From a paper:
The LytR-CpsA-Psr (LCP) (LytR - autolysin regulator; CpsA–capsule-associated protein A and Psr–penicillin-binding protein regulator) is a family of enzymes responsible for the last step of the assembly of WTA and other cell wall glycopolymers. LytR and other members of the LCP family have been described as pyrophosphatases. They cleave the pyrophosphate bond in glycopolymers precursors. In this work, we studied the LytR protein from the Gram-positive bacterium Streptococcus dysgalactiae subsp. dysgalactiae (SDSD), a known animal pathogen and one of the leading causes of bovine mastitis and fish streptococcosis.
In this study, the structure of the LCP domain of LytR protein from S. dysgalactiae subsp. dysgalactiae was determined at 2.80 Å, confirming that despite low sequence homology with other LCP-family members, the overall structure is highly conserved. Analysis of the electron density maps suggests the presence of three sulphate ions at the surface of the protein. No electron density was observed at the active site that could correspond to bound substrates. The regions S48-Q56, G70-Q77, and N335-S342 are highly disordered, with no interpretable electron density in the 2Fo-Fc map. The structure is composed of 8 α-helices alternated with 12 β-sheets in a 3-layer (αβα) sandwich architecture. The characteristic central six-stranded β-sheet is sandwiched between the α-helices and the double-stranded antiparallel β-sheets (β4-β5, β7-β8 and β11-β12). LytR LCP domain contains a long and narrow pocket located between the central β-strand and the α-helices 3 to 7, near the N-terminus. The presence of this pocket is extremely conserved in the LCP family of proteins corresponding to the binding site of the undecaprenyl units - the hydrophobic section - of the physiological substrates. The binding site of LCP proteins is composed of conserved positive and negatively charged residues: two aspartates (D68 and D83 for SDSD LytR) coordinate the Mg2+ cofactor and are present in all members of the family identified so far, except for just two cases. The positive charges come from four conserved arginines (R154, R210, R212 and R222 for SDSD LytR) that are expected to interact with the pyrophosphate group present in the native substrates.
Author numbering: 57 to 69, 78 to 334
Write the structure that this text describes.
Amino acid sequence: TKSFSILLMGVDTWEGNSDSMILVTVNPETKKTTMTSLERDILITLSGPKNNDMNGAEAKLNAAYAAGGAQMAIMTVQDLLNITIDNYVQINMQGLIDLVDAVGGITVTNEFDFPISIADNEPEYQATVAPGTHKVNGEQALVYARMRYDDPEGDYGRQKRQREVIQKVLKKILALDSISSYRKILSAVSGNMQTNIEISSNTIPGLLGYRDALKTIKTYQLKGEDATLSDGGSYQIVTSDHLLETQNRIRGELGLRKVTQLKTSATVYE
């Protein structure tokens, strides 16, 4: 019954590439969970083992994972937000499909006037989401989550959608009453999910002591301005203003002191 922080990472497979970085704050006391999406494109100074060539390099946040696995991603995001992160959870795409299936599916709304597909690009995922509101399986949930319009305005939507999927999966998990139910869900994702959190017969029930925090899930996005790179690629500097409100929002939920200055490994305009 204490507030804790977890860094959620989707990974194309445990070395591979970060497809998502969500900081989740769980407060059982306030009965509130916050999910803040961190832009893969933010420019930042990476933090890793000193053993590592990329420790100290200024790069996009996406690159922490690519250089030193989940260890570097945590070190890097710790220095981005000036808060200590208690645990991490990597899931890959098979993971995400298995999990959505294991909770009985979810309901999403395709806002557009055309079905959503990604097979043209990635033919391993031939699923599709009709327009309107429909119950969706794991294969259809991944596709909704991974669809990028490949526009400067692509991730923003992709990130809202990724958050949605997780939130909806989490609402299904609240409504579970059995420990077996939960045991079956950790079975379902066994191969395709990895974490600091201890998984045993000891912990599956210890976990249900936090379900109360799923009663209110507020979603958020850390953002700034889209700029250009010499290769023609795209990055984003964080407006120091937006950055602090973000460290303070999270710190609050995690039961901590509001900060006065802005200590960050990130590259602000100033």
